[PDB]
Amino acid sequence: GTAEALLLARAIVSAVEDAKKHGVPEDLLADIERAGLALAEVGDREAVLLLVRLINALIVAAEAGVPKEALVVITHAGILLALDRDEEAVDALLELIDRLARAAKAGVPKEAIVTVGVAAAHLLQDRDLPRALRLLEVVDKLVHMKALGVPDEEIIAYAKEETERAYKGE
Amino acid sequence: GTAEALLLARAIVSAVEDAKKHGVPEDLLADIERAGLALAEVGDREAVLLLVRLINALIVAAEAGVPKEALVVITHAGILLALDRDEEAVDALLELIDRLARAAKAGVPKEAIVTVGVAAAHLLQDRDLPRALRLLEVVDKLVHMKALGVPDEEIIAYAKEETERAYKGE
Amino acid sequence: GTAEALLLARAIVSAVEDAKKHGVPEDLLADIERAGLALAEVGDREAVLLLVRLINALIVAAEAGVPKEALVVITHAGILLALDRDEEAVDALLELIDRLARAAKAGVPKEAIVTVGVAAAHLLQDRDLPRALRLLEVVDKLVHMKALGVPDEEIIAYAKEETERAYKGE
Amino acid sequence: GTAEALLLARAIVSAVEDAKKHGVPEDLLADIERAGLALAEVGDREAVLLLVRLINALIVAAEAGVPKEALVVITHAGILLALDRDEEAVDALLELIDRLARAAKAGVPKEAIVTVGVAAAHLLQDRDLPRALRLLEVVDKLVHMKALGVPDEEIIAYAKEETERAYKGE
Amino acid sequence: GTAEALLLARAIVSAVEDAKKHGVPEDLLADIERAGLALAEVGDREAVLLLVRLINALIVAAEAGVPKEALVVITHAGILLALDRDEEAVDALLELIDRLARAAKAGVPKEAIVTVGVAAAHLLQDRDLPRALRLLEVVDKLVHMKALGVPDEEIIAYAKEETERAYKGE
Amino acid sequence: GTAEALLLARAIVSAVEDAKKHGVPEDLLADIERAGLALAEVGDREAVLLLVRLINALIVAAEAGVPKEALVVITHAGILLALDRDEEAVDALLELIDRLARAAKAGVPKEAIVTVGVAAAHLLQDRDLPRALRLLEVVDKLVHMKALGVPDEEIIAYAKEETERAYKGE
Amino acid sequence: GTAEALLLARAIVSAVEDAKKHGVPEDLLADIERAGLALAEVGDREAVLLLVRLINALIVAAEAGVPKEALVVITHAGILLALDRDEEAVDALLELIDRLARAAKAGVPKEAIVTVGVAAAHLLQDRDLPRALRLLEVVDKLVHMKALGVPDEEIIAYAKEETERAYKGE
Amino acid sequence: GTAEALLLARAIVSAVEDAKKHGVPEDLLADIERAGLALAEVGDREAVLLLVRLINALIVAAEAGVPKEALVVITHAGILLALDRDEEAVDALLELIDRLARAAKAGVPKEAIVTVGVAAAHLLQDRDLPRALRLLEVVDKLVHMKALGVPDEEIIAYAKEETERAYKGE
Amino acid sequence: GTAEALLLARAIVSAVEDAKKHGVPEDLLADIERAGLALAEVGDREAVLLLVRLINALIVAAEAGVPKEALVVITHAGILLALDRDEEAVDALLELIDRLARAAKAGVPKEAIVTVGVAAAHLLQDRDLPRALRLLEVVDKLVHMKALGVPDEEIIAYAKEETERAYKGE
Amino acid sequence: GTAEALLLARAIVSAVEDAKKHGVPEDLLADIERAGLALAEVGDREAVLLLVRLINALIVAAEAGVPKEALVVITHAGILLALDRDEEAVDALLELIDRLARAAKAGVPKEAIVTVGVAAAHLLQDRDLPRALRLLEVVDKLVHMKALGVPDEEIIAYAKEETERAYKGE
Amino acid sequence: GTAEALLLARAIVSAVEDAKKHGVPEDLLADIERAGLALAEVGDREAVLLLVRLINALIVAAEAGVPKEALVVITHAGILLALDRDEEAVDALLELIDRLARAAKAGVPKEAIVTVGVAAAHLLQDRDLPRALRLLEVVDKLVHMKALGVPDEEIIAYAKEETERAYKGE
Ligand SMILES: [Zn+2]
Ligand SMILES: [Zn+2]
Ligand SMILES: [Zn+2]
Ligand SMILES: [Zn+2]
Ligand SMILES: [Zn+2]
Ligand SMILES: [Zn+2]
Ligand SMILES: [Zn+2]
Ligand SMILES: [Zn+2]
Ligand SMILES: [Zn+2]
Ligand SMILES: [Zn+2]
Ligand SMILES: [Zn+2]
Ligand SMILES: [Zn+2]
Ligand SMILES: [Zn+2]
Ligand SMILES: [Zn+2]
Ligand SMILES: [Zn+2]
Ligand SMILES: [Zn+2]
Ligand SMILES: [Zn+2]
Ligand SMILES: [Zn+2]
């Protein structure tokens, strides 16, 4: 069904153009668009619409102000998870993006956000769900600390310790 | 199988005669007929049926009232794409022809139709699908703008801007 | 595989002989047999079985009493569609044959049947599926008006109006 | 792949030899074997396994005692349906063979079995599924009438009437 | 190898004698036999096979009742096409002979058959395939018109109009 | 390469000697051997292989008990068809030989076999495939009728009627 | 994709070598290996993995001590069913192998196991599922009788009567 | 769809490079990469993603410190089960890897881990789920004994007896 | 291209020398070498590689211990089948050689191997594939009977009866 | 079919003229045109359309501003891969051209683009897909680093290190 | 077409010059170049491109450090297999080359590599795929044994035993 392939390609291109209008970085969009058109040529519906979900999540994150390194790691992990047709891991990634957007809007320092976001996106890309959930809890704790008035240095230190604990396996 | 070659040649000739009875311009039919007979000589079925599809799309476009320049560019691109046995590119071309036919029937100015149709047909001929899809979105936008009551000058200006945006690469 | 080509040729010949025993007109069978033997020479299976399906549908239509003009147009269209290996268009044509057979058995006037059947078969030959579907709706409506007791003159008038609307593009 | 063709040929030959050991008449087996070897030469798997299914159904029918006329008609229809790779029609044919075998075992008179079986096999050969299903219902009714104690003359009359009704189209 | 030349000569002579027994006119067979023996002296296998095909087609045409003027023109065109080893044009010629035989058996008036047959044979002789295919379509239309009950005079007039259209180039 | 010519000649001579040891009549083998050596002198591989296939089919037919007149007609037709390198017509002839061998083994009367076989072989020699396929169906029907217990006189009458229908063109 | 074919071939060869190390008879593995390599040459995944399933089942049966006659019949039936891509019939065969292995380990007499296993494997080869299921119930019943202390002679007699009942059709 | 094949190949290569960065032994990665590229050439999505799952599980096991012998056996079993597209067996394999990783991190002696892991991976490779589940229970029992303070010698002995019981079939 | 002829000649000579080093009898190699060089002179690729396949199969058979008489018959049949470029019959012959090698290695008596092998090679030589496949089944049955412990006299008797049945045509 | 050869030649010439109008360097077009005409002479469709794809990719790359050395290496590799009829390798090459075009548009230093592009094109020419995919990942990483604000010297150093690792084999 | 012959000759020469620059020994390149030019004279595309694949595999093996004796045997076998146009056997040979390259890079002793590689290449030359696949399993086992720390003497002994088993046929 080539008409369905054309419909999926048009969906991907329209989502990419809307995201570009919203202010999403163009390199991430180029990666997602290449993967999406490749998947639309073979009529893979679920993967293409998971990519569209990732694009909308990136729109949210880019509006919030999430740093670019975390966005690059998240985009790569999301492309691989959309290739999986893994809806659960994709939902976990979208929840991570939402938490990082809240953290960035709340004024959490950029270094802590980059640390925890990169670690959690890598853990999600490696199909390691419990550790990713622990890092999600760490992000929520950081947001609450920022709202409580804890200084930035202590927040960065706490993020570093919790991330190194997640990496070490303790 | 020379009988199969004769069958394909008769299919091409019947399609061209029907298109002539419908009012399709004769030079485009001459191009398609020469290419189709050459392909039928070697028993190339898929290319021949792609050419028959292009003939039927030309019937639709000529009935609508699409300008001749766009039809010439479309015919050349369609012959080249039927040579490649490119079903997806041919389907995109047929979708473009349908959109241009709707735009012509709706009263969109001839200058805008020529601009967007020629640009999109050239992009499809160069195997550039994302930019062609963006131009298809431009055609849809022109049709809706005409239905909304936007004056012809603004429609021409918008078509020129978007077409130059796609051509330049922005 | 010449044995497979012989098998397909025998399938075509058996179908044609059974159709002749059933009362299908011989000229339509001659066209189908020539096309089918040409396609069997090159071992084109799908096209040959599509032609066999057309033969069986013609058996049904001839038993019902569908007029010869519509049958000729349908046979030519079906041969051309079997050449394309277009299963969807062939199925739409067979559904059209069935609706025309029901209309003939129900006593719908011959003029209305010829008008709508010729128009729909031509549209199916030209790859115009939405308009063909609208004309199929017209056939069903005519059958219902005949069952309701509407006089023949009104049925002919309604068929003429709807067919002219389909041709004109309204 | 000539090894696959050899495997398919061996499957057909083994099935034919087993059916011959079971008591299936040899002319039907010769027809099926010729068709099967022709299809195995071109590596047509699905058709070959449909022919093997038909051979097993003929084993069942020959063990039950189905008359030879219905078996000849069924074998020809089944070969042609296996050529189409029509799994639905082949399943309807096998279901018909099963009903005829049950009718023969139940003592339904030979004339009724021949009448209904020949009519239903011809209808299945012509891709007329609803009428074939009505005739299958007729076979079931005949079996129940035989089990109820209705004399053979009334069973024959009922079978003749229902078969004439199906053929006439009423 | 002169043994192969003798084999080819015996093939030609056997075909000519069989055609004589079937009722093919003797002057046409004289032309074909002279051409065939000349081509057999130099061991031209393909040309001699094409000539034997032409002889068999003449058997069919003379059995049907095709007029003699068309037969003379067809024979000359067939000899000159066999000289070229033109399998496609020879196949087109044989298809024309078959269509004219169907027309002659169907009762189409002799004048229409002569007009269209002479025109199509001359066009095939001049290597004009598209116009010859248009004239083949005209022959098919004549046969269907005769089957529909159209009077002889109208058939003659329509054949004249279509043939003059083809000759004039319209 | 005359070494290849010697190889082909030795192939022909070995096939002829094996067929002679199998009981094939000698005049047919003389005809085939002369044609085969003439074709091997000029290094015609495909024609020689077709002749070897004809020899092997004659082995089968002579073992079954096919009458001699049919064998003579079949041998002449096969030599002429092998000269044309006609794989499809040669395959049809081998299928006819197989069906006649089955009929002869099944006890079909000699007159019926001679009638249908001579007619079908002549039709295959004249490149008339549809009527030849109809006569193959007739042979199959004769075998089934003999298996069903139909008397010899009725079988002869039916074969006469169907063959005269084939000759007459009905 | 010849790399996939090499992967499938290596899968078959590895399974065969493992089974040989486990003590499966070598002739059965020879049949399975020939079939598997033939199917891997054409990249038939499902058939190859069904053959691997059969190999593992044979490993289980050989470890249990199932007699060789039943194993040969089962291997031939399984090769033919893996050719079918018949997952349901293969599952029934594997469950039969499991029941026969349990019966062999439980001390059921060899004669009864051979009788019921050969009968059920033949019924599964003939695509007769209800009778095969009845024989599977017979195997389970025999295992329970052996565990209950019934003497071997009574077990053999009961198996003989139940198998004869299944074969006869009662 | 060669773009999808390129996407799958890039996914496999990215997973292999990440695993190499994590410390997985290179020979196992070479095996998995070769199999994955072979399966991506034919566009087998599910198998490729099962291989990626195996790679991530190997990352976990290598980080924990599972001995190399069990890892080699597990890699071979995982490649073969991914060729199966057997999601359930792959899930059982991954659960086995997780249990062995926990055992290694808990200080269970290397010999016991090697014994039970090799046995369970072989049983999974032979599609024997219940025995593999029993061996999984054995691994959990060993972890609990190590946490309870049982010395190494009795842990090794218990693993040996339980594995011997699983292999023997008791 | 005589360089290609030289390449083919060197391929034949290398294969023959390797076969001589493996222990294949020299006279069979002389026949194959003469045929191969003659076919290489005329640049016949497919026939030469078919002969190389035959040489390798002879290596396998001579290693196993197949009797010499069957080897002579097989070599002559293979040369004449390679002349025909018959890949299916050559594959059947190679499958027969493999089965005979298995029978010879398993200890099947020499008389049985000679009887069945000579009969099947002669049947393959005469283009009789169904009977050859039945004889292949006979060879497999002999191997299984030898593995089951049946005495040599019974194996010889069974082979004699089945081969006599194959010759007689039953 | 010389008409098909002319059609392919006109396709190549039209593509080359369009590429000149777009600004592609003339020497690369001269190489591609010579290769394409040589392939069109022998009627090699797939190779010619692969060359047309390479021309279009060159249009994209030349518009972006890709350095000429990488373009020369890519053109030579693409010509040899179109000779291969290797759709997968050609698609990998086109993906590499797209990534290099994105890198050139993003401002990545010319030295890094030349280094990585030349290495990856050479690896693709030598049929080393995994290392080419690693280098594609390197190109993506360079683009992201340029978008992040990393200085040009660091980008050049990183590209040199990664390319040296790929070439060395680490 | 001699232009295509020139294109193929240039492809062979370019591949040989690149391989020479990579460090492949010159005598193997001389053999491949002579064979490739001879095949290019006759326009044999598939064989020439199989030879180019063999050259690239030789590049990989020579870079790894595979001994020269194995390389000579592999080159001769590959030239012969490319003459056959045997894509499956060529792919098995290339995968063997890759496994030997991995073994050489991993430090496996030269004696083991030479033994197993020469045996497997000879088996692939003789079209013995199952035994070649067994030896490929042996190569993988050697690589894993080297990675596990087994001393060189035991690796050599195990390789010798497995190769002797394969040669003997056990
Ligand atoms: Zn938006
Ligand atoms: Zn029209
Ligand atoms: Zn819209
Ligand atoms: Zn009918
Ligand atoms: Zn309705
Ligand atoms: Zn049975
Ligand atoms: Zn005649
Ligand atoms: Zn007509
Ligand atoms: Zn013989
Ligand atoms: Zn029959
Ligand atoms: Zn095992
Ligand atoms: Zn990782
Ligand atoms: Zn050897
Ligand atoms: Zn067996
Ligand atoms: Zn352009
Ligand atoms: Zn990226
Ligand atoms: Zn290189
Ligand atoms: Zn391994």
Coordinates of N, CA, C and O in Angstrom, one line a residue, chain C residues 2-3 5-6 9-10 13-14 16-17 20 33 37 40-41, chain F residues 53 87-88 91-93 95 99 129-130 133-134 136-137 170:
Chain C
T2 N 7.1 -24.7 -18.6 CA 6.1 -24.9 -19.7 C 4.9 -25.7 -19.2 O 3.9 -25.6 -19.8
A3 N 5.2 -26.6 -18.3 CA 4.0 -27.4 -17.7 C 3.0 -26.5 -17.0 O 1.8 -26.7 -17.1
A5 N 2.6 -23.3 -17.7 CA 1.9 -22.5 -18.8 C 0.8 -23.4 -19.4 O -0.3 -22.9 -19.7
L6 N 1.1 -24.7 -19.6 CA 0.0 -25.6 -20.1 C -1.1 -25.7 -19.2 O -2.3 -25.7 -19.6
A9 N -3.2 -22.5 -19.4 CA -3.9 -22.5 -20.7 C -5.1 -23.4 -20.6 O -6.2 -23.1 -21.1
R10 N -5.0 -24.6 -20.0 CA -6.1 -25.5 -19.8 C -7.2 -25.0 -18.9 O -8.4 -25.2 -19.1
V13 N -9.1 -22.5 -21.0 CA -10.0 -23.1 -22.0 C -11.1 -23.8 -21.3 O -12.3 -23.7 -21.8
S14 N -10.9 -24.4 -20.2 CA -12.0 -25.1 -19.4 C -13.1 -24.0 -19.0 O -14.3 -24.2 -19.1
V16 N -13.7 -21.1 -20.4 CA -14.4 -20.6 -21.5 C -15.4 -21.6 -22.0 O -16.5 -21.2 -22.4
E17 N -15.1 -22.9 -22.0 CA -16.0 -23.9 -22.5 C -17.2 -24.0 -21.6 O -18.4 -24.1 -22.0
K20 N -19.4 -21.0 -22.3 CA -20.2 -21.2 -23.5 C -21.4 -22.1 -23.2 O -22.5 -21.9 -23.8
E33 N -10.4 -15.3 -24.1 CA -9.6 -16.4 -24.4 C -8.3 -16.0 -25.0 O -7.2 -16.5 -24.7
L37 N -4.8 -16.8 -23.1 CA -3.7 -17.6 -23.7 C -2.4 -16.8 -23.8 O -1.3 -17.4 -23.6
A40 N -1.0 -16.8 -20.4 CA -0.5 -18.1 -19.9 C 0.8 -18.5 -20.6 O 1.6 -19.2 -20.0
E41 N 1.0 -18.0 -21.8 CA 2.3 -18.3 -22.5 C 3.5 -17.8 -21.7 O 4.5 -18.5 -21.7
Chain F
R53 N 13.4 -36.0 -26.0 CA 12.2 -36.0 -25.2 C 11.1 -36.7 -26.0 O 10.3 -37.5 -25.4
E87 N 9.0 -25.3 -27.5 CA 8.9 -26.0 -26.2 C 7.5 -26.2 -25.7 O 7.1 -27.2 -25.2
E88 N 6.7 -25.1 -25.9 CA 5.3 -25.2 -25.4 C 4.5 -26.2 -26.2 O 3.7 -27.0 -25.7
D91 N 5.6 -29.7 -25.4 CA 5.1 -30.1 -24.1 C 3.6 -30.5 -24.2 O 3.2 -31.4 -23.5
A92 N 2.8 -29.8 -25.0 CA 1.5 -30.2 -25.3 C 1.4 -31.5 -26.0 O 0.5 -32.4 -25.6
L93 N 2.3 -31.8 -26.9 CA 2.3 -33.1 -27.5 C 2.7 -34.2 -26.6 O 2.1 -35.3 -26.6
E95 N 2.1 -34.2 -23.3 CA 0.9 -34.3 -22.5 C -0.1 -35.2 -23.3 O -0.8 -36.0 -22.6
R99 N -1.7 -38.8 -22.0 CA -3.1 -39.0 -21.9 C -3.6 -40.2 -22.7 O -4.4 -41.1 -22.3
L129 N -3.6 -24.3 -30.6 CA -3.6 -24.8 -29.2 C -4.9 -24.9 -28.6 O -5.2 -25.9 -27.8
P130 N -5.9 -23.9 -28.7 CA -7.1 -24.1 -28.0 C -7.9 -25.3 -28.3 O -8.4 -26.0 -27.4
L133 N -6.3 -28.3 -26.8 CA -6.6 -28.5 -25.4 C -8.1 -29.0 -25.2 O -8.3 -29.8 -24.3
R134 N -9.0 -28.6 -26.0 CA -10.3 -29.2 -26.0 C -10.3 -30.7 -26.2 O -11.0 -31.5 -25.5
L136 N -7.7 -32.6 -25.6 CA -7.2 -33.3 -24.4 C -8.2 -33.5 -23.4 O -8.2 -34.5 -22.7
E137 N -9.1 -32.5 -23.2 CA -10.2 -32.7 -22.2 C -11.1 -33.8 -22.7 O -11.6 -34.6 -21.8
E170 N -17.1 -26.1 -34.3 CA -18.1 -25.7 -33.3 C -17.5 -25.6 -31.9 O -17.9 -24.8 -31.1

